[PDB]
Design a protein around this motif. Structure first.
Motif, PDB file in Angstrom:
ATOM      1  N   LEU A   3       0.814  -1.210   0.000  1.00  0.00           N
ATOM      2  CA  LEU A   3       0.000   0.000   0.000  1.00  0.00           C
ATOM      3  C   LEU A   3       0.853   1.267   0.000  1.00  0.00           C
ATOM      4  N   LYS A   4       2.167   1.091  -0.099  1.00  0.00           N
ATOM      5  CA  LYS A   4       3.099   2.214  -0.180  1.00  0.00           C
ATOM      6  C   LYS A   4       2.903   3.211   0.959  1.00  0.00           C
ATOM      7  N   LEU A   5       2.716   2.696   2.169  1.00  0.00           N
ATOM      8  CA  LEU A   5       2.451   3.549   3.322  1.00  0.00           C
ATOM      9  C   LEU A   5       3.678   4.341   3.750  1.00  0.00           C
ATOM     10  N   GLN A   6       3.458   5.607   4.084  1.00  0.00           N
ATOM     11  CA  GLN A   6       4.527   6.497   4.525  1.00  0.00           C
ATOM     12  C   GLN A   6       4.183   7.156   5.857  1.00  0.00           C
ATOM     13  N   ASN A   7       2.936   7.006   6.288  1.00  0.00           N
ATOM     14  CA  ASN A   7       2.480   7.619   7.529  1.00  0.00           C
ATOM     15  C   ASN A   7       1.215   6.952   8.055  1.00  0.00           C
TER      16      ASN A   7
END
Length: 156
Positions: free
Chosen positions: A92-96
Motif C-alpha cells: 500500500l506504499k504507506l509512509q504515515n
C-alpha cells in the motif's frame, strides 16, 4: 468465507496479520472492507501516535453501532498495525499513519482482480480535529453502506 467471518474478535473487528494478509487482501465477494491502518506501540523514536489511539476508539464505537443497527450489512472491519505487517506496508506504499480506507466489493464480473493494493477505495481523512467525531465518521460509513444509523452522542 465462513473462515474469514470467524476471525472477528469480541468487538467485531478482524486483526490483519502477516499470515492472514494475503487471504484477507483478496476480499470476500459482495463485502465492503473497512480498514484502519494504525500504529499502537512506539515508533523507532519511542514516540506514540496520539491520533491513532484517539481514532481507534471512534472506529470501534461506530463499528459497534453498525453491527447492532445494520445486521444485514455486508461489511467487514479490519485493523492493521504498520509495525506488524510489512508486506501490507509495502503493498500500500504507506509512509504515515493513521489511515481509514474503505474498499467496496468488486463487481461480480471483476472479482478475480480484487486486491487491497490495487482496488479503488474511499479514504476518510484523519486529523486531530475529527479524531473523536463519531457522528461524522458514522455519516461517512452510512453513506457508503447505504444505511441509516444513530450513534450515541455526547451532545444531544
Amino acid at each position: 468465507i465462513d473462515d474469514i467471518l470467524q476471525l472477528k474478535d469480541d468487538t467485531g473487528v478482524i486483526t490483519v496479520t502477516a499470515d492472514n494478509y494475503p487471504l484477507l487482501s483478496r476480499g470476500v465477494p459482495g463485502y465492503f472492507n473497512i480498514l484502519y491502518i494504525t500504529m499502537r506501540g512506539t515508533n523507532s523514536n519511542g514516540m506514540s501516535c496520539q491520533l491513532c489511539h484517539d481514532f481507534e476508539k471512534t472506529y470501534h464505537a461506530v463499528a459497534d453501532v453498525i453491527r447492532s443497527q445494520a445486521p444485514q450489512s455486508l461489511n467487514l472491519f479490519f485493523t492493521v498495525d504498520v509495525n506488524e505487517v510489512p508486506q501490507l506496508v509495502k503493498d500500500l506504499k504507506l509512509q504515515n499513519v493513521p489511515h481509514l480506507v474503505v474498499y467496496p466489493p468488486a463487481e461480480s464480473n471483476k472479482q478475480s482482480q480484487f486486491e487491497w493494493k490495487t482496488s479503488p477505495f474511499y479514504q476518510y481523512s484523519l486529523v486531530p480535529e475529527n479524531a473523536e467525531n463519531t457522528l461524522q465518521f458514522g455519516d461517512f460509513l452510512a453513506k457508503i453502506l447505504n444505511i441509516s444509523i444513530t450513534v450515541p452522542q455526547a451532545f444531544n
